[PDB]
Amino acid sequence: MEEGGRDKTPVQSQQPSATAPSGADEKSSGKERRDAGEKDKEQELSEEDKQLQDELEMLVERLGEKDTSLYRPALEELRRQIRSSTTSMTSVPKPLKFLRPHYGKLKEIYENMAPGENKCFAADIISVLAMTMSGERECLKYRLVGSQEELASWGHEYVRHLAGEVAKEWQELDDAEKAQREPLLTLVKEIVPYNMAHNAEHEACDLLMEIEQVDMLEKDIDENAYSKVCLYLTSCVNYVPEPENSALLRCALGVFRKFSRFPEALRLALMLNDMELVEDIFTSCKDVVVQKQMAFMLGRHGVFLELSEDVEEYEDLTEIMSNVQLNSNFLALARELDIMEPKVPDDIYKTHLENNRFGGSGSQVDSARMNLASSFVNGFVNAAFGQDKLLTDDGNKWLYKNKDHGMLSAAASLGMILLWDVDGGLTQIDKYLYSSEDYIKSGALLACGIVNSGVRNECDPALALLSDYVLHNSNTMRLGSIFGLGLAYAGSNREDVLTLLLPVMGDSKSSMEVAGVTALACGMIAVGSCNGDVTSTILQTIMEKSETELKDTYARWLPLGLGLNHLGKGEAIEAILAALEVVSEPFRSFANTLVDVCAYAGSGNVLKVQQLLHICSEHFDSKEKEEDKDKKEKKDKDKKEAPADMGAHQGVAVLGIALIAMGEEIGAEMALRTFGHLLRYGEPTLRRAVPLALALISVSNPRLNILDTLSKFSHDADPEVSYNSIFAMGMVGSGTNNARLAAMLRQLAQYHAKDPNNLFMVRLAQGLTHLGKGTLTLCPYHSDRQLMSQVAVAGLLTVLVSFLDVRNIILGKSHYVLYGLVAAMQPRMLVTFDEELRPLPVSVRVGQAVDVVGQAGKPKTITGFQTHTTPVLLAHGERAELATEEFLPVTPILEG
């Protein structure tokens, strides 16, 4: 306790000195306030100087003591004295050194109270001192790392001195870039990623990165600290408004891409949706890092890693932009291009077809409605592609024999099965065009666009074939060219693509249900980039809504397409907007709220508020009911804020569907269908248990359509032991029969629930995060808010493509194979500072590879600690790859 004590020379009496200001100090409080002003400066220096030495020693000594509740209020009262006339009024040379332990008084307060309000307050006061000290702060942190007399508290507390910088009340470049951020990051994964996100001190970190990597390797775990900063930025959307926020997301993306660790960079880029960002990722990483590393390879890989929707490499706005970036990046032109090109990811898929086989039971059962239903099932068993190639190649049996709508639909779906072929899918398409009715021929055009996508980078692309097709008069053939063009590219800002859409899309209502899909397809082209727009989609949408909205499926696509087209930034949009504004409808009003979100280039704070002053659960006939269901789900929102924040959001989304259902008698049936699509988009925390639980109740309850939607997501794990669960679910599907109409919905449900052994389920997020975004899934969802299904309706549902490429193991540095890798198993979870959690290996052996599956294999990790390396790419295999970063141009990892 003893009063004063920082006025007594022994190092022992420093420890009671810290407690002492609670009563008051004998000389020490008066020395700093009263005596400093009252008495002359030269005379004071004697008194002060003896006090300085102790005060300094005491700082390491206080940290050495363990109290924070006796320690905290006592040093805080003393703090007021220093501020009065010992801050910089005393003399010019003496205060700078006196401010150094002063910093210490405040730090304990900064640390203990870990809220955001204390963080702020604490910062305002600390920043002014920093400027006064003029670099005494960097040295102070250095002594702390050493520990003269410290041994615990200083690890959380010293980070807080860095936290103080953010405010910049008077601090220009007097400590804002480099002040030992790099030791501070390495030890503490918590407090620094917050400080780092706001400051844009993160820029300096790029310079540092080589050095930092050394600590990252196996001395410390820095890898965890980097992974953390992304978590805070996505969460920061709610904290601080989106217009303030957009610059912050943009700033972190530059630094993340440059620094080698790509997965954090992709999450931000994906959210922004612009043209500029994608090219940059390749070139930045190369120039800062002088060694080849993982860094060159990352520019390719980041494209691969990213999971948006549909065709391989996903967004493929980035892949079309890459063709000359690839040239600059150079780790070999020929190699880099061949792997980057979809031929390599296609090639591995083919090899996989032999082991995979087909695990369901096929059917191509000739003639009747049975034929038409059967054609659908073929695609459904895989839920993508597998070894169906054999069945599909015979044209004669299924396709030609199909009657009416069944021919178009079967023919339409055929391209989605054959995706993950470069050629030999194509031959089948070319033949079908020739034969039979207009319907097979029309569905074939769309099919060509998807198959051809297996090779691009100006190596025989999708555009060339589709352009000729676009002219066709028939509404079905037109739809096939434009829908194939949005599906294949799934992002485009090439001139040729945009100009082709420009005079077509003259449709606004047609007998054919599938014609509404044209709007979605034009919006699809916009995604992933800034605006050039295509006039026709924008003009037709408002017109369509007033004109027809009776066909619910038709109606859903046109406003959605309108918002998606707007997405991004530019002045091209300004011109068409004037034309759109002159007309004002109640109908246009909902479309407009989606546009606000779109316009800004991804929102999540603006989006949030809008979902409270909602269009949700609102109708007058089906006038406001167009966007109402889609909005309620708030799937886009859930995924957008951290993987951690997602858990909660997901429970709320479910709750919300339940809420829409109570309100409207009609909405109840829809709310059941909505759950399969919601779950499917979302990448939920409540993953296995929930769809199955509903599915059983739904057998007993009327409406077979409920089972059919529920089944897409419920298929879950693919057989390793999951066979028992699939077969039981399947048994319930089979047993039921009471009509053909009833039977068609069940038949599809049985075969979808089943999966061939070691294939994969659905994914829409990148597989190290829950952030994603598709546009592909909005289509099946829209046409399955009806009662029952039709032959027409069935054709849209057949696609569920946005599924994995078959690599989930060693993307590697000179590998790129299907072949496995050493893995170890841990039941452990100790982390909360990883992108989706990844544990540390104990290096104990288990069967090769992490699961090719879209779930599972998440705690099963890579071993790269008998390699003495650190993984950039975290182990998961939800879509993830096990690759590691070395200084070396190649990973010298072991195989098995």
Partner 1 sequence: EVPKEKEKEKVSTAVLSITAKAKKKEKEKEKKEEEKMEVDEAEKKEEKEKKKEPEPNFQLLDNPARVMPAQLKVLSMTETCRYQPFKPLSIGGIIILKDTSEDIEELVEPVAAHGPKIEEEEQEPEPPEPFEYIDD
Partner 2 sequence: QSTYSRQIKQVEDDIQQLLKKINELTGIKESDTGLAPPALWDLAADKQTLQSEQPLQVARCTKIINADSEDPKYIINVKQFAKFVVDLSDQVAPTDIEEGMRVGVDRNKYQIHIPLPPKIDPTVTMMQVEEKPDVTYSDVGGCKEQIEKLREVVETPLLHPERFVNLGIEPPKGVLLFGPPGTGKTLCARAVANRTDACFIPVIGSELVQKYVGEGARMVRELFEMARTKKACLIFFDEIDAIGGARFDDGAGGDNEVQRTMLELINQLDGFDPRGNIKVLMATNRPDTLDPALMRPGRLDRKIEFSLPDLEGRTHIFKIHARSMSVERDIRFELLARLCPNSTGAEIRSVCTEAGMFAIRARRKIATEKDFLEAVNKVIKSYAKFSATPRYMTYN
Query: Widest CA span of the chain, in angstroms?
Result: 110
Residue among 40 and 117 whose Cβ is closer to partner 1: 117
Who's near 39: CB < 8 A, 6+ residues apart? none
Residue among 238 and 790 whose Cβ is closer to partner 1: 238
* Residue 443 burial (CB count, 10 A): 28
Q: Total residues at the site for partner 1 (CB under 8 A)? A: 10
Q: Could you tell me if 767 and 880 are in contact, meaning their C-beta atoms sit under 8 angstroms apart?
A: yes
Does the footprint of partner 1 cover residue 240 (CB under 8 A)? yes
Of partner 1, partner 2, none, which one does residue 613 interact with (CB within 5 to 8 Å by kind)? partner 1
Alpha helices, H only, 452-551: 462-469, 475-489, 495-501, 517-526, 535-547
Contacting residue, 506, 702, 892, 896, with partner 2 by CB under 8 A: 702
Minimal distance, residue 676 CB to partner 1, in Å? 28
Q: Which stretch binds partner 2 (CB under 8 A): 256-264, 358-366, 510-518, 839-847?
A: 839-847
Of partner 2, partner 1, none, which one does residue 288 interact with (CB within 5 to 8 Å by kind)? none
For residue 760, give the nearest of 810, 697, 716 by alpha carbon. 716
Residue among 846 and 890 whose Cβ is closer to partner 2: 846
Strands 883-885 vs 823-825: parallel, antiparallel or unpaired: unpaired
Who's near 495: CB < 8 A, 6+ residues apart? none
CA angle 743, 747, 752 (to 5 degrees): 150
Contacting residue, 15, 112, 171, 238, with partner 1 by CB under 8 A: 238
Minimal distance, residue 614 CB to partner 1, in Å? 9
DSSP state of 310: S
Of partner 1, partner 2, none, which one does residue 238 interact with (CB within 5 to 8 Å by kind)? partner 1
Rounded to whole angstroms, what are the CA distances from 78 to 1, 4, 45?
A: 15, 11, 20
Does the footprint of partner 1 cover residue 648 (CB under 8 A)? no
Of partner 1, partner 2, none, which one does residue 244 interact with (CB within 5 to 8 Å by kind)? partner 1
Contacting residue, 60, 521, 694, 771, with partner 2 by CB under 8 A: 694
Contacting residue, 92, 578, 582, 612, with partner 1 by CB under 8 A: 612
- Residue spans of beta strands (DSSP E) within 172-232: none
Of partner 1, partner 2, none, which one does residue 702 interact with (CB within 5 to 8 Å by kind)? partner 2
Does the footprint of partner 2 cover residue 787 (CB under 8 A)? no
Rounded to whole angstroms, what are the CA distances from 762 to 310, 683, 829, 855, 861?
A: 11, 9, 25, 9, 22
**N- to C-terminal Cα distance for the chain?**
64
**H/E stretch holding 861:** strand 860-862
The DSSP secondary structure of 720-746, one letter per residue, reads SSTHHHHHHHHHHHHH--SSHHHHHHH
Q: Which stretch binds partner 2 (CB under 8 A): 211-219, 511-519, 612-620, 843-851?
A: 843-851
Residue among 446 and 672 whose Cβ is closer to partner 2: 672
Binding mask 182-221 for partner 1 (x = CB under 8 A): ----------------------------------------
Q: Which stretch binds partner 1 (CB under 8 A): 451-459, 591-599, 605-613, 795-803?
A: 605-613
Does the footprint of partner 2 cover residue 896 (CB under 8 A)? no
Positions in 706-765 near partner 2 (CB under 8 A): 721, 724-725, 727-728, 731
Q: Could you tell me if 78 and 29 are in contact, meaning their C-beta atoms sit under 8 angstroms apart?
A: yes
Strands 860-862 vs 823-825: parallel, antiparallel or unpaired: antiparallel
Positions in 454-473 near partner 1 (CB under 8 A): none
Rounded to whole angstroms, what are the CA distances from 862 to 39, 733, 839, 849, 874?
A: 69, 39, 9, 9, 8
Does the footprint of partner 1 cover residue 239 (CB under 8 A)? yes
Q: Which stretch binds partner 1 (CB under 8 A): 86-94, 103-111, 602-610, 637-645?
A: 602-610
Of partner 2, partner 1, none, which one does residue 612 interact with (CB within 5 to 8 Å by kind)? partner 1
**H/E stretch holding 823:** strand 823-825
Report how far residue 804's alpha carbon sits from residue 782's, in angstroms, rounded to the nearest whole number: 24
* Residue 21 burial (CB count, 10 A): 23
Positions in 303-342 near partner 1 (CB under 8 A): none
Residue among 480 and 839 whose Cβ is closer to partner 2: 839
Binding mask 678-707 for partner 1 (x = CB under 8 A): ------------------------------
Q: Could you tell me if 884 and 869 are in contact, meaning their C-beta atoms sit under 8 angstroms apart?
A: yes
Q: Read off the amino acid at residue 309.
A: E
Does the footprint of partner 1 cover residue 609 (CB under 8 A)? yes
Q: Which stretch binds partner 1 (CB under 8 A): 233-241, 251-259, 726-734, 881-889?
A: 233-241
Contacting residue, 493, 605, 617, 709, with partner 1 by CB under 8 A: 605
Of partner 1, partner 2, none, which one does residue 657 interact with (CB within 5 to 8 Å by kind)? partner 2
Rounded to whole angstroms, what are the CA distances from 29 to 33, 48, 79, 101, 255?
A: 7, 12, 9, 15, 47
* Residue 114 burial (CB count, 10 A): 12
Report how far residue 342's alpha carbon sits from residue 847's, in angstroms, rounded to the nearest whole number: 29
Residue among 739 and 844 whose Cβ is closer to partner 2: 844
Positions in 83-122 near partner 2 (CB under 8 A): 113, 115-118
Residue among 239 and 727 whose Cβ is closer to partner 1: 239
Q: Which stretch binds partner 2 (CB under 8 A): 466-474, 560-568, 821-829, 863-871?
A: 821-829
Q: Which stretch binds partner 1 (CB under 8 A): 160-168, 393-401, 606-614, 627-635?
A: 606-614
Of partner 1, partner 2, none, which one does residue 665 interact with (CB within 5 to 8 Å by kind)? partner 2
Residue among 210 and 596 whose Cβ is closer to partner 1: 596
Altogether, the residues listed in the chain come to a count of 896
Contacting residue, 845, 892, 894, 896, with partner 2 by CB under 8 A: 845
Rounded to whole angstroms, what are the CA distances from 141 to 6, 108, 147?
A: 22, 15, 10
Residue 43 CB-density burial (10 A; 0-12 exposed, 13-18 middle, 19+ buried) = exposed
Half-sphere exposure of 249 (CA within 13 A, CB side): 29
Residue among 526 and 653 whose Cβ is closer to partner 1: 653
Report how far residue 627's alpha carbon sits from residue 521's, in angstroms, rounded to the nearest whole number: 18
- Residues after which the chain is broken (C–N above 2.5 A) are none
Contacting residue, 23, 73, 241, 506, with partner 1 by CB under 8 A: 241
Minimal distance, residue 623 CB to partner 1, in Å? 21
Does the footprint of partner 1 cover residue 613 (CB under 8 A)? yes
Report how far residue 785's alpha carbon sits from residue 434's, in angstroms, rounded to the nearest whole number: 36
CA-based Rg of the chain, rounded to a whole angstrom?
A: 31
Minimal distance, residue 616 CB to partner 1, in Å? 11
Q: Which residues bind partner 2 (CB under 8 A)?
A: 113, 115-118, 657-659, 661-662, 665, 668, 671-672, 675, 694, 697, 701-702, 721, 724-725, 727-728, 731, 825-828, 842, 844-846
The site for partner 1 (CB under 8 A) is made up of: 238-241, 244, 605, 608-609, 612-613
